[PDB]
Chain A
C-alpha cells in the first residue's frame, strides 16, 4: 500500500486513472480524530488521511460518482 500525495493526486486518479472504491474509515480508537479515505487502484491501495471531516466531504465530491464510495 502507499500514501496518496494529497487530494490532487487522489482526485486525478479518481477522475481518470483506474479506481474501484474510496472507503472512508472514521477516527478508529480516537488515536486521531481524522478520517482516512482509501482508494483501491489496480496497482495499490492509496490512503489520504484528512484532518477535518468537512475537508473529506469536498474531496469525496471530487471523486467521480463512477467510483464506489463506502463509509465506515
Chain B
C-alpha cells in the first residue's frame, strides 16, 4: 500500500472525492427531502475493490 501503483492511487482517489454528503444548497434547489448520499463509504466497514 505504501508502495501503491499510480492506476490504483487514482481509482482510490475518486472514491475519497465522491465520499461527500449532498450539498445543503442542492437539497434546497432540488427539494430532495431525503438527505443522504448512500454511495458514501466508511473505511472500516467498506470493502472497496473487493
A–B contact, 8 Å CB criterion (strictly below): no
Which residues of B does A touch, CB under 8 Å?
A: none
Which residues of A does B touch, CB under 8 Å?
A: none
